[PDB]
Amino acid sequence: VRKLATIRTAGEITPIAGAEAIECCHVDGWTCVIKKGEFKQGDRGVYFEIDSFIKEDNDRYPMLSKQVIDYEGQRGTRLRTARLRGQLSQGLFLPMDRFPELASNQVGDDVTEILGITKWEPPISTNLSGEILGEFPTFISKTDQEAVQNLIPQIEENKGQKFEVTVKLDGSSMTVYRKDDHIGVCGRNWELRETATNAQWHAARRNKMIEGLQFLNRNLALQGEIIGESIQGNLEKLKGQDFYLFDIYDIDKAQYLTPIERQSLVKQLNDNGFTVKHVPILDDLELNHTAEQILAMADGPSLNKNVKREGLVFKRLDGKFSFKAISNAYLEKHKDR
């Protein structure tokens, strides 16, 4: 997981025409509204990303005062995407002289624990939050993806590489895995017990993927998104619920399969009557883009080609560098994300 609060550098600062108390600060690939004169280009500050939850503290955080709410039994503010007078704003960026306990930290430091910042999350469905069997397997990587806005040097340093481009479906991450004599089914954070009502187990039995892992005889984690009815508002307008694969983790080797290895294995499972669906795949992209350009492609058709998708995921063909681009128009349309 993640660095919600980090020391970064003011990029170009541009005037927000009309409202003269404020200006727009570019912070890596993010765009952030600041008060005028608060930073100049090159100044360092603490950048709080969207989804940070910042505890009530009007000494340090008076600009969060009217948006204080109660979340997991604590008073404080969830940082969220906003469009103000045409101006896209995401995150909070405070100059370093507001944090005297950080005067010895360096640019790029992860200061999230030191500052007490927590991660906000949408509530989980009744059937996705079944009965917990244990921890998420520590021998499986989780399905988190780094945002393109946080990868400016890595994006320029990947020009000419080729990427599998998939649609990000808006559901719940799910993992079905075999390790030796154990086959498990997990949600986003816990391994779950099979019951007649558990959504993830039901999806896994319905597309036979537990039999598929038994057939394959390998220590593999199939990872994908469960989507459908009563899951995150069912953007795709499905009947029932279904699993869509986007990754397969080689447990013995501790690396994800490459895109073509993954397609190979999906082909093999379907050939043997284990029909697992894949998230929609678009044309491979040869990278030569800016983050702003990547974000520009995020909007478009989803699995259901008549709805607007959450974004895109990009996976380099060697399976060694992956990132996501969340559609900003999608975050303006749904304010519970």
Q: What is the resolution of this structure in A?
A: 2.2
Q: 326, 306 in Cβ contact below 8 A? A: no
Separation of alpha carbons 80 and 77, rounded Å: 9
**Residues 57 and 186 reside in one and the same domain:** no
**Residues 53 and 129 reside in one and the same domain:** no
Separation of alpha carbons 122 and 41, rounded Å: 35
Could you say which of 122, 155, 188 is where a domain stops?
122
**Residues 93 and 29 reside in one and the same domain:** yes
Q: Which helix (H) or strand (E) holds 227?
A: strand 220-228
**Residue 200, CA atoms < 13 Å, CB-side half-sphere:** 31
Method: X-ray
Taking alpha carbons only, the member of 289, 324, 2, 292 closest to residue 157 is: 289
**Residues 101 and 182 reside in one and the same domain:** no
Q: Name the burial class of residue 309, with classes exposed (0-12), middle (13-18) and buried (19+) by CB atoms within 10 angstroms of its CB.
A: buried
**What number of H helices and E strands is found in the chain?**
7, 24
**Residues 165 and 137 reside in one and the same domain:** no
Domain count, the chain: 3
